[PDB]
Amino acid sequence: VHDSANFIKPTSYLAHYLGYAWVGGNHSQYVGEDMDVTRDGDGWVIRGNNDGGCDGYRCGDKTAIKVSNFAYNLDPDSFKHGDVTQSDRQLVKTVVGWAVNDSD
Amino acid sequence: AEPVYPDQLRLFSLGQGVCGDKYRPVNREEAQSVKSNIVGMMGQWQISGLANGWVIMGPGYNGEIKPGTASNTWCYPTNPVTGEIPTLSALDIPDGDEVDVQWRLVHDSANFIKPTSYLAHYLGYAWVGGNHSQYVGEDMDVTRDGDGWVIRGNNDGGCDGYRCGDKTAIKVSNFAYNLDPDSFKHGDVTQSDRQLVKTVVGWAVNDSDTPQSGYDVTLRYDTATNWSKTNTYGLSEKVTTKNKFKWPLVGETELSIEIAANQSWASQNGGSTTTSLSQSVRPTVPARSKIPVKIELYKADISYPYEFKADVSYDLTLSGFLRWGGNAWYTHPDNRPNWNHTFVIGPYKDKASSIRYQWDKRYIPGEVKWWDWNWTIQQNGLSTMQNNLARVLRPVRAGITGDFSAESQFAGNIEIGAPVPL
Amino acid sequence: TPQSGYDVTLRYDTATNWSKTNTYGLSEKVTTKNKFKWPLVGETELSIEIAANQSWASQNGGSTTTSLSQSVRPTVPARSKIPVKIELYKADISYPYEFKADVSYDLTLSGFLRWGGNAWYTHPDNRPNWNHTFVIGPYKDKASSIRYQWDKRYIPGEVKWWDWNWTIQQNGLSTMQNNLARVLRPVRAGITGDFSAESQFAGNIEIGA
Amino acid sequence: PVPL
């Protein structure tokens, strides 16, 4: 989400092409410039920097781009896991037994 | 583009864009990623120079980043250090019972008491130390409290200072053992207070001319508990009319007519638990022969000794009030509140209890929700914090010998007897 | 070809259950009563009632089930037939047995503790009645284990039943060591006995010719 | 199958 040329710019331009208003910060006039990136909960928010002042109708209502719900398509042979460790072990139940074979 | 650690940032008042050697100016995006940290290290009306003719401003200007120029420049090292917490070699405890190993761990002054006391001090816990010294982590009493241990400054005699009687307490509990897989061994299993549940004896008879494996005897015993709660709410409406008539034969008659309606809503939540134990015997019977079988199920107390070699992890709780002058909690309280925080020394369990996760994520302000480690680095230096945290998170390895014991478990016996010719 | 795909299964289950329920209720009712002269019916008494009720119930229960299953799965030769039989009985069962074993036991002490000095960690001085159980054998719990308490006497926080340091001070380390060694001496014996139980299961599974 |  901090990749300007590969993420911030194309997504900002897509928002602009669809008709979302004020895609960009107050310190430029180009779409997708002067954007702030913040970590919000489990997602990220990219929004034009609303500092100083702006000229325009409702220029303070910057368009927000939210990134969330990341998923990972794994390469099948690449998964590896380390040691499994257990904590706070509370016994549920146990059984001991004998299996006797008197036959031949 | 690249993560920036605030501790490596430095201001140079050497003119517009002229940093020191081995340092380069910080650009706008890097400054924005760590804006709160940089604005925190600036004067209220201070204006500092970024790269590419940009400028960041102080808290008076809400930390605004805008095109401009200035005389001081924010710079970052050309080859920054990663700042990772080092990994030290394992501390070996002499073998013994679990409580003995815990005892040896919590009475180690150089490897446990000092680093943990220093960690409590760097975070801003007040009065980490006893009354008979002024150094942090000295004159500490260790006591065995229930299933845990308490390390607290010795509050004997008298002390000078504000609320000097409220010593910070360090609690050690919730021990866990990551076993070496090939090291576990157990001794004889012994049973006591055996109460018979049920037995079955049987015969498997084979009159055919070939061996037969198709026999099955199965004894199963199940126990369950259940619970439920129900809340009901009702409403009712009723209308009655009463009149008087002279019916021909019966004479004076009183007639009542009543119409009623009712509505009810009920909500129920419940649950259950079930435990089942099954034993089966499936003998292979030789041709023209018969085999006796027996299954028995008992309830019994079970005991056995065991031993293994393990890595040892534990929960470390810090209790006390945070210093008014400065503490590392992210809101930085100033009213000296009481505070308890638990770390998990060992494998990751969650973010709030993991020192390593917070330390690694200190470059993301939105992730900083419990402890401000950048603040500790600024107060004490990066190398000092690294060394203290490396000693706090040092792995511990020990040989353990113990006894398992449990009451009212299951004891089974399955027997296939000797064949009898037909 | 020979066929092994046959199955006859007889299963018998018995169960018991129990339940307990506690219920609490509240009710509120408002009634108004009036008199009118309705045209044709004449003098009429009209009652209007509105009620509300609330109820809370709490249930706890349990069950126990015992199941006995017997299956026969004969392998039948080609162009042939085999008779099968399964029987289930309830019966009393008996048999003799013998083995060689180590012998453990519970040892209870009952009496009043001396006023002059006793080894209980609180050291009562009012001569109270006292019963304490030790398990002579494998470990079961801390309170009944002499060896655990003896080994842990170096930790004051673990000293919660008997003060063995006090006994060492009063009598000497070697004396207490020898006495406890004789108390915890293992015992080995040959045992011959009889098993007997009523209302158990007896089965019979038969594959014929 | 995928080799490990």
Numbering used by the authors:
A (entry chain G): 106 to 209
B (entry chain F): 1 to 422
C (entry chain E): 210 to 418
D (entry chain B): 419 to 422
Paper text:
Aerolysin is a β-pore-forming toxin produced by most Aeromonas bacteria, which has attracted large attention in the field of nanopore sensing due to its narrow and charged pore lumen. Pore-forming toxins (PFTs) are important virulence factors of many pathogenic bacteria, which are secreted in a soluble form and upon host membrane binding, they oligomerize into transmembrane pores undergoing a complex structural reorganization. Domains 3 and 4 form the 120 Å long 14-stranded β-barrel, with each protomer contributing two antiparallel β-strands. Four distinct constriction rings, two at each end of the pore, were identified from the structures and confirmed by MD simulation.
